[PDB]
Structure 1
Amino acid sequence: ATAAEIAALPRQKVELVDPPFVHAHSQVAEGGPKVVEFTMVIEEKKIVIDDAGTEVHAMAFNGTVPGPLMVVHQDDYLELTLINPETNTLMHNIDFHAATGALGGGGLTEINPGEKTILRFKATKPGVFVYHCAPPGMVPWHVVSGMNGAIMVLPREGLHDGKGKALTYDKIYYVGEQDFYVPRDENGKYKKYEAPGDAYEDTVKVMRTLTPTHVVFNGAVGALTGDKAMTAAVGEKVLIVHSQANRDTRPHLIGGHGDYVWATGKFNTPPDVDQETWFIPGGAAGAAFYTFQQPGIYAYVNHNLIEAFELGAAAHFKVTGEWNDDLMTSVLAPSG
C-alpha cells in the first residue's frame, strides 16, 4: 500500500483492559484492513510482589505487569500512541516482536519523561508476539522490572486447527509471567529503595546469577488465585495466551491439557495436540486452546514445580458444571 491507500482505511480506537482480561474484539475480521489505534501511558511505580511485603520498582505499560494484550488481525496496521509522563524518571521505548524494522520500533520510540510518540506498523504475520521496552544500554533491566506484554495478530478468518477446521473460543485470558531479581542484604532480607535508579547496581548483581528470586503471573505471588481465579464452565472453549519476555517457561494446566497448542505462538505453524506441558522460550508468547470437561479448581503452573510453588508461578481456574464419572471416578475413597 501507498501512504494515500493507508490514509483512506477506516480507523478504529480500542480501549485497553487490564490483564488477564482482553479488550473486546472479533475473532473473524469484520471487514477489510483497518488502522487500529491504541494509547498507553507508562508508569514507574512500586509494586509489592509477595506476602512478605517485598517491593520491586516496576516500569509498567499502562500501569500493569504485564502490559495489556492488544488484538489486531493480519494486515491491519497497529498505531500506537505511547506517552511517558513528566512524573517518570527514565527514558523508555517499545519493541514489538510482531513488527519489521528499526529494532521492532525501539529505534523510533525513545521518549523521555514529558514526551510522547506515535508509531504505526503493519501486522504482517499472524500469531501472539511479545512486546517490551529496550532502551540502549539498559535493555534487560527494563524488561525484568516488568516492562513487557504481548499482542495477538489473529488470521483474518479466525483460528483454525492443522487441518483447516475452525476453532472458536468462548473466553480468552492473558497470563504474563515475570522473573524478578530482588536484592538482599547480609541477613538475607530483601532491600527497599526510594527511586528506581537507586536499585540498579544491586539488581544487576542478582541478574548476572541468572537465578530469579520470584517468578510470578500478573505481577505478584497469588495474583490469579483464590478469588482472582480465572473462571470458565464445563463445555466452554478457552484460549490461554502466555508470554515470557526473558526466561523460558513450561506451562501446564493441572487436571487438564492443551488440546491445541501453538507453543511457538505463530498461527501459520500448525498446533501441537493433546499436550500435557508445553514450552515457551524466553522472548516469545504461546497460546493453548482447551475445552473444559470437568468442574472444580484447576491450577495453571510453570511445571518447574519449584518455580511454581516456591517462587510464585501458579494461578487458579475455577470451573462450574457437573462431574463426569466416566472420565474419572473415586472407586474407593481414602480409607483404612
Structure 2
Amino acid sequence: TLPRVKVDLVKPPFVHAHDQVAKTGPRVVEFTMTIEEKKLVIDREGTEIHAMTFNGSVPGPLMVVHENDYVELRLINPDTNTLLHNIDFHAATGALGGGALTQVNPGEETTLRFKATKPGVFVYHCAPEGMVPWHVTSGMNGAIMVLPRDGLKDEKGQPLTYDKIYYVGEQDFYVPKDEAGNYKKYETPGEAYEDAVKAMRTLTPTHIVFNGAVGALTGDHALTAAVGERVLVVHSQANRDTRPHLIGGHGDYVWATGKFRNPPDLDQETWLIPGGTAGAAFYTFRQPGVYAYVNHNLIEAFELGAAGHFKVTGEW
C-alpha cells in the first residue's frame, strides 16, 4: 500500500540526493548493490589487498531514508565473486529472515526489507558465519542514515539544516607480512585467509584509511565547502574505535554515537566513535583555507593513513 521510490547510490564520500525534511509520509525506498571482490591498492607503496566491497567501493555507499520508511535492498552477488556474503544492518530489528534467507553465494541475489524505526546513522556490514572479522576488515561495511521525519534539531529543539553532507568511512586493514617484513600479495581472497586471521589477532592495524586508501580524501579529492556553509559529516567505523577531529574547526553539534533521539553535544574538539558505530558531526565554516580531518590518534592519522583534507573557499 506504501508508495515506492528508487534511489541511485553514489560512491562515497558523496551522498545520493534526498530531502532533510521529508516531503511525504512513510515510503518504501528501493536500493540496489552489487558485491564486488577485487584487488585494491591502499597506500603509496603499491601495497595490494583483496578487498570485499559493496558497489566496488570502500566504504560502501551511504543510504538515506526517513524514520519509519521501509528500506528495501536488492543485494546481488555475481558469479565473478568467489565468496559467500551476508549483509547485516544495525538499523534493523531481528534476523531479517534468517541467515539461510539473507545469505548470498556467488551467482545468487536476494532482496531485504526492514522498517527503519529508529532515527540516526547506523553501520551496516557483512556478517558471514565464522568469517565476520575478515570481511569487515576487508572493506565490507558502510552506513545508512535514518533522518527524523522533519530533519535534524539542535539541543534546544530548533532545526539544523545542512548545505552539504559527506560520508567518511574509516577502515582498518591488517595486511600480513612475511619474515623479511615485506607485505604479502595473494591471487585470490581465500589464499589470504590463513595469514589474515593471524594478522588480525595482533589487534594492530597496518593501515587505517578514509575512503579506501591513504590520501583518498586529499589532493584533488579533498572534501569541499564554502565559508558560511553548514556541513554534516557522517563518520563510521565498523570494527575499531576512532576519534574524529577537524583541524582548525570543531564539531558544533555532534552525535558521537549517532542516534538523533538524543540531543547533540556542543563545541566538541574531538569525539569518540566506538567500533561498530556511526557518528555525525555538524559544523559551519567561518573561514577559508585548508582544514584537515583526522583520527586524533596522530600516529594512526599521519603514519597509518587516517587523514583527509577540506578545501574551503570564500573571503577571509
Cα distance in 2 for partners of 1:109, 1:212 equals 30
Structure 1 consecutive aligned stretches of length 4 or more whose deviation exceeds 6 Å:
none
1:232 corresponds to: 225
Cα offset for 1:226?
A: 1.2
Root-mean-square deviation over aligned CA pairs: 1.0
Structure 1 segment 233-272 matched on structure 2, within 5 A: 233-272=226-265
User: Aligned to 1:273, which of 255, 262, 266?
Assistant: 266
Structure 1 segment 1-40 matched on structure 2, within 5 A: 8-40=1-33
Cα distance in 2 for partners of 1:129, 1:92 equals 19
User: Aligned to 2:163, which of 162, 170, 186?
Assistant: 170
1:298 corresponds to: 291
Unaligned runs of 5+ in 2: none
Cα distance in 2 for partners of 1:108, 1:280 equals 31
Cα offset for 1:53?
A: 0.5
The amino acid that maps onto 1:316 is H
Structure 1 segment 214-225 matched on structure 2, within 5 A: 214-225=207-218
1:47 aligns with 2:40: yes
The amino acid that maps onto 1:311 is L
User: Aligned to 1:319, which of 305, 312, 315?
Assistant: 312
Larger Rg: 1
Cα offset for 1:103?
A: 7.1
* Cα displacement string for residues 282-333 of structure 1 (whole angstroms, at most 9, x for unaligned residues): 000000000001100000000000000000000000000122xxxxxxxxxx
Cα offset for 1:185?
A: 1.0
User: Aligned to 1:85, which of 61, 66, 78?
Assistant: 78
User: Aligned to 1:161, which of 147, 154, 164?
Assistant: 154
1:194 aligns with 2:187: yes
Cα offset for 1:60?
A: 0.3
The amino acid that maps onto 2:194 is E
Which TM-score applies when normalising by structure 1? 0.93
1:94 corresponds to: 87
The amino acid that maps onto 1:146 is G
Cα distance in 2 for partners of 1:180, 1:322 equals 40
2:105 corresponds to: 112
The amino acid that maps onto 2:77 is N
For 1:169, what is the secondary structure of its paired residue? coil
Q: Is the 8 A contact 2:96 2:114 kept in 1?
A: no
Cα offset for 1:108?
A: 3.4
* Cα displacement string for residues 207-251 of structure 1 (whole angstroms, at most 9, x for unaligned residues): 001000000000000000011000000000000000000000000
Cα distance in 2 for partners of 1:26, 1:192 equals 44
The amino acid that maps onto 1:223 is A
When residues 273 and 138 of structure 1 are mapped into structure 2, their CA distance, relative to the original with a 3 A threshold, is same
Q: Is the 8 A contact 1:97 1:104 kept in 2?
A: no
% same residue? 83
Which TM-score applies when normalising by structure 2? 0.99
User: Aligned to 2:134, which of 134, 141, 161?
Assistant: 141
Unaligned runs of 5+ in 1: 1-7, 324-336
Equivalent residue pairs, number: 316
Cα offset for 1:109?
A: 1.1
1:326 corresponds to: none
Cα distance in 1 for partners of 2:99, 2:35 equals 15
2:173 corresponds to: 180
* Cα displacement string for residues 30-61 of structure 1 (whole angstroms, at most 9, x for unaligned residues): 11100000000000000000011101100000
Cα distance in 2 for partners of 1:91, 1:130 equals 20
User: Aligned to 2:64, which of 71, 76, 89?
Assistant: 71
For 2:38, what is the secondary structure of its paired residue? strand
* Cα displacement string for residues 128-184 of structure 1 (whole angstroms, at most 9, x for unaligned residues): 000000000111100000000000000001110111100000000000000000011
The amino acid that maps onto 1:166 is P
1:282 corresponds to: 275
Cα distance in 2 for partners of 1:51, 1:164 equals 46
1:310 aligns with 2:303: yes
Cα distance in 2 for partners of 1:159, 1:232 equals 20
* Cα displacement string for residues 80-113 of structure 1 (whole angstroms, at most 9, x for unaligned residues): 0000000000000110000000179756310100
Cα offset for 1:196?
A: 0.3
Cα distance in 1 for partners of 2:8, 2:142 equals 16
